């Protein structure tokens, strides 16, 4: 009445309260399919009850699917029933009698489960491990550019409306990467010590680059560099501060392993020790300019001169000060 009449007659509330649809009708086919679909229901037996539920139009489902794939969760459809989102099937959509539509929304909710897992790993810090944190940061840098697209697409519904098939085919170069992210996250939660709990994710990330060596491997590379930030920072701390960073032994060296830094590993240990044996008498910010200006083949062999020159300087200076004023020979 008055205000509530305007609210019900121009917008929904037949979608969160069981009311008949206010989306306009006429008679026959697309207008009102109710008579002929009731006849088809009666002829083939509607069992013992005609199929009728609350009924919603397509666009509400479209913006809910884009909200679910966008990153936010717990909607009216795609309810989380036991830990994984799935379609609410107590809503009728009259053509297809929501059985084919159940299959298509079940596939979309299966992708929404991956979205839920990534947002769940996000939520377990906001609202330390220091390698999971650098992982969820590059995950954030993906998701900001990711749901930018879905916000842009959802704007075009308001400005006439655009069908569901166009907007699910529009997000294909993101969902193709979402399957890669699904395989990435699986060993990041699968897991004793904090060093093997990071090694299990980082060796999988190092292996997955060789799987696609398009657009996925560049995402994997930009994700991969931003998860070894604590290790490059810790190695540089071992060089120039003379001390390995401690996190209840987050690091590999006790004071198996990943193969990211193993072929240069003898050039690292013999560096860091040689600083403290000098004192007993930055480096990541060189690697990132290379990232500013084929990956894990030629670019990986350019990382090793960075630590190799600093290593050579440190060990040569230590050898020089032992070969004069003590003079081992």
């Amino acid at each position: 009445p008055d205000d509530r009449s305007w609210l019900e007659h121009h917008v929904v509330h037949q979608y969160w309260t069981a009311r008949p649809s206010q989306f306009p009708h006429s008679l026959h086919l697309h207008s009102n399919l109710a008579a002929v679909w009731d006849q088809h229901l009666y002829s083939s037996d509607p069992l013992y009850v005609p199929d009728d539920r609350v009924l919603v139009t397509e666009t509400q489902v479209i913006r809910e699917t884009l909200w679910l794939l966008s990153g936010v969760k717990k909607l009216f459809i795609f309810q989380l029933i036991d830990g994984k989102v799935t379609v609410r099937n107590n809503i009728i959509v009259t053509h297809l009698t929501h059985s084919c539509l159940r299959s298509v929304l079940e596939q979309i909710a299966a992708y929404g489960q991956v979205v839920f897992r990534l947002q769940e790993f996000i939520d377990e810090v906001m609202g330390p491990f220091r390698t999971y944190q650098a992982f969820m940061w590059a995950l954030y840098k993906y998701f900001i550019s990711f749901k930018e697209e879905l916000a842009e697409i959802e704007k075009c519904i308001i400005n006439t409306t655009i069908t569901l098939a166009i907007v699910v085919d529009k997000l294909a170069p993101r969902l193709s990467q979402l399957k890669v992210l699904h395989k990435v996250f699986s060993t990041g939660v699968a897991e004793t010590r904090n060093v093997v709990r990071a090694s299990h994710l980082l060796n999988t990330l190092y292996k997955a680059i060789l799987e696609y060596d398009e657009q996925t491997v560049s995402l994997l590379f930009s994700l991969w560099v931003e998860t070894v930030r604590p290790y490059l920072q810790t190695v540089d701390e071992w060089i120039v501060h003379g001390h390995l960073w401690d996190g209840a032994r987050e690091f590999i060296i006790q004071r198996t392993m990943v193969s990211f830094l193993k072929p240069v590993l003898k050039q690292i240990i013999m560096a860091g020790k040689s600083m403290q044996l000098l004192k007993n008498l930055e480096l990541d910010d060189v690697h990132d300019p290379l990232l500013a200006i084929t990956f894990e083949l030629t670019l990986r062999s350019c990382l090793y001169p960075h630590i190799d020159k600093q290593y050579l300087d440190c060990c040569g200076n230590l050898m020089q000060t032992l070969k004069k004023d003590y003079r081992l020979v």
């Binding site: 509530r4 305007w6 306009p24 697309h30 207008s31 399919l33 397509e58 479209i62 053509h95 308001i158």
Partner: protein, 267 residues
């Protein structure tokens, strides 16, 4: 064309509800869609949900008012000191207003404390506060010349708190004379660095001008100057010069240089 063409136009979406031979009709609008025209309907409805739990008499003023710009001009008038129609000297407009009223109500408490320019250093402190008044009147109605509502609250949040500290510094007894000038002195040692530190430094820089003028008297003319008793040295054996801010180490030199100038006047 325009509205008629949009009203006619068949949609590129065909629903999964019904298929085959549509006449086509648009989008079903959303409820967060166009979020600035339906406050009125719900301000009545929230009032109703409140009245059901409250028995029937609790109410809630402001189901709307007024515009963006008129509300902005009234809130800008609050900081000067003119109260609005809701004061005398949606529902969360009052949630804004309580924090911009308070910053307003202390500003008058400086201008009322600067209505007159006692003690001469007290007048110097009042004239120093007048400089912050003259800065603050230039700050407002240059950067917000009737812009939207939240620019008013954001711009004078970092600035209004600095003003509220100066409300705590003033009384609106209150120290006066040298008891004021030491009290402003010790405060400058108490606050080494804060956003209120340059304001206290600007007050203290002009609050010692009459004291330096009193210091200039005994050396250059041998004059003991008092008008309210606002100088530290106040009132025999040959000289009647007064004897019981600077240290006492300089004050004794001032006391003996007045006697020296009294001897040299006859030389």
């Amino acid at each position: 064309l325009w509205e008629a063409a949009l009203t006619y136009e068949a949609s590129k979406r065909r629903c999964w509800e019904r298929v085959g031979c549509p006449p086509g009709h648009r989008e079903e609008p959303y409820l967060t869609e166009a979020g600035r025209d339906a406050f009125d309907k719900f301000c009545r409805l929230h009032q109703g949900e409140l009245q059901l739990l409250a028995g029937g008499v609790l109410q809630a003023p402001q189901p709307v008012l007024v515009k963006e710009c008129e509300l902005v001009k009234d809130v800008l008038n609050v900081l000067i000191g003119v109260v609005s129609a809701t004061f005398s000297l949606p529902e969360s407009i009052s949630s804004l207003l309580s924090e911009v009223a308070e910053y307003g109500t202390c500003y008058t408490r400086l201008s009322h404390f600067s209505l007159q320019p006692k003690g001469l250093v007290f007048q110097a402190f009042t004239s120093g506060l007048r400089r912050y008044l003259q800065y603050y009147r230039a700050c407002v109605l240059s950067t917000p010349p009737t812009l939207s509502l939240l620019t008013i609250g954001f711009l004078f949040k970092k600035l209004g708190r600095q003003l509220r500290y100066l409300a705590e510094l003033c009384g609106v007894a209150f120290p006066t004379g040298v008891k004021l000038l030491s009290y402003l002195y010790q405060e400058a040692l108490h606050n080494c660095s804060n956003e209120h530190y340059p304001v206290l430094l600007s007050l203290l820089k002009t609050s010692c001008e009459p004291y330096t003028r009193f210091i200039h008297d005994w050396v250059y003319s041998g004059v003991f100057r008092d008008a309210y008793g606002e100088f530290m040295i106040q009132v025999k054996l040959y000289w009647t010069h007064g004897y019981v801010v600077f240290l006492k180490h300089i004050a004794h030199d001032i006391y003996v240089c007045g006697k020296t100038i009294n001897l040299l006047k006859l030389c």
